Amino acid sequence: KTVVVTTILESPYVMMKKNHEMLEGNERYEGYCVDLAAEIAKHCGFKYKLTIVGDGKYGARDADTKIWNGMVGELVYGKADIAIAPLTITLVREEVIDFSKPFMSLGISIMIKKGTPIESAEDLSKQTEIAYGTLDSGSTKEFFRRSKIAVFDKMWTYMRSAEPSVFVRTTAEGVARVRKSKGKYAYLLESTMNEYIEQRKPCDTMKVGGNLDSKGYGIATPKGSSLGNAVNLAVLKLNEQGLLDKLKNKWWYDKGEC
Amino acid sequence: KTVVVTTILESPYVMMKKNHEMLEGNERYEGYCVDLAAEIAKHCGFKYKLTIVGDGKYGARDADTKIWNGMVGELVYGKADIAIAPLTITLVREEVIDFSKPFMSLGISIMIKKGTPIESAEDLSKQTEIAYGTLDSGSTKEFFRRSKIAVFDKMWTYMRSAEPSVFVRTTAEGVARVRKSKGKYAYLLESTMNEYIEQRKPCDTMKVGGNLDSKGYGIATPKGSSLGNAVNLAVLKLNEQGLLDKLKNKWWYDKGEC
Ligand SMILES: N#Cc1cc2c(cc1[N+](=O)[O-])=NC(=O)C(=O)N=2
Ligand SMILES: N#Cc1cc2c(cc1[N+](=O)[O-])=NC(=O)C(=O)N=2
């Protein structure tokens, strides 16, 4: 059977090709996860159809309705067979779906406009002159919200109550706020996206300091799926062959503009 | 049943207490993995006995007998229920045992004696004045053996023919060779051990360059074990509570000597 692959439009993982209107099927897409999907399918020996997740989300469970959204939702309600995307391995997601070993490692990091006198999450917590925030929804905001660590707790206390508001609705908006605030706004996001934007024009952004936590992106399958075991081994095979580092280098640095 | 935990004497994961001769059972030992073992057992709700692996090895399929040695061997042949140690997640081990998601992320780094005019792997590859090698077996040597990357291919071509020999049989031997060779020997090893030794007296070593690859240590159980699922969730939970980072900070930097 043709395996249904759910994925998300996030650069440079899955992007629409220049002339995607002319093309059909899996040819419409390109990127890290498009290249990874091809390798995973070749190792496990299956045909696959790429599909973009309906609501354009990763996967979170609502506190009211209890309904899963995003790609996690698409796996648990049987709308897709496998999730090949930068989907963060988390406790609450691992309870409902299975993750492969991480194909990429990452952390929460600090994005600054070049020239900003900040280097550390400690620095940001000790001042206010430079504003800092996260995305208005999802993983990074939840990290600071639930953190019991002193310094991240002090940063959440500030961000809860900052005037003007410091949260942004999209990544693009967070990046634009950093670029246009003349070094007075710092943006907290996934280290992988931070280092990608650092390679985009007009090269005015910079990743600084060490990561605040340690996470991994994994490929997701449903509980008891017949693909889980082979997919897990494929990821390790591809890591030891050096293809995951070669794949990252291609989409982050070879196609880099800085 | 009392869960049999296999582990290895490797600092600072498992170490003999100053007066272990007086103490019995699990009280003889201390370290990162000792503390982690207590946390995993508390979350999963089992009693446990810490046992040091008889042959003092991590685990590899013997060349002649094809029999697994070390901690991997103790899980595969039914001697142990769980391995709590810095056991590198690799394809060949994953084919015979089950791994939790990584509790620690790391890679290959460079150890130099302070003073050595080396800052990266590229610097190393451009010269033949200062010798450099790896452990005589395991993941670090394999990476260089397989690598298609020009710089690492050039480093392997040098290493595999170097005179005198640049490979060492133990970590203690590699570390000692750096300390006794007066800036003429650099040692390639796992980043975690590198940064541990940097905090050890007499404080004459330094970690330089970014990581050359990336891998992880996992908690391991036998295939189809009922303990695997809960242990995996435990590791993720402890990472999200910030405990794995506090344990890292405790044994590396809080107890540091430099
Ligand atoms: N890249 C990336 C990202 C990957 C993400 C993400 C946010 C971002 N991001 O916008 O930076 N949130 C998630 O909950 C997730 O599973 N994976
Ligand atoms: N720490 C550590 C280490 C952990 C290791 C290791 C070597 C080292 N080392 O001494 O550098 N070899 C392995 O095969 C392994 O599974 N885990």
Structural class of chain A: alpha/beta
**Radius of gyration of chain A, whole Å:** 19 Å
CATH topology of the largest domain in chain A: D-Maltodextrin-Binding Protein, domain 2
Q: Tell me the number of structural domains of chain A.
A: 2
CATH architecture assignment of the largest domain in chain A = 3-Layer(aba) Sandwich
Strand coverage percent of chain A: 15-25%
> What would CATH call the class of the largest domain in chain A?
Alpha Beta
Oligomer: homodimer
Number of helices of chain A: 10
Shape estimate of chain A: globular
What characterizes the major β-sheet of chain A? 6 strands, mixed
Offer a quick outline of the entry.
The structure is a homodimer of 258-residue chains. Chain A contains ten helices and twelve strands.
Structure, described:
Chains A, B: Belongs to the glutamate-gated ion channel (TC 1.A.10.1) family. GRIA2 subfamily. Chains A, B: This is Glutamate receptor 2. Chains A, B: It comes from Rattus norvegicus. The structure is a homodimer of 258-residue chains. Chain A is of the alpha/beta class and 258 residues long. Chain A is built from 10 helices and 12 strands. In chain A, helix 1 packs across helix 9. The longest helix of chain A has 13 residues. Chain A is globular. The termini of chain A are far apart. Bound molecules: 7-nitro-2,3-dioxo-2,3-dihydroquinoxaline-6-carbonitrile (2 copies). One 7-nitro-2,3-dioxo-2,3-dihydroquinoxaline-6-carbonitrile binds next to strand 5, strand 10 and helix 8 of chain B.
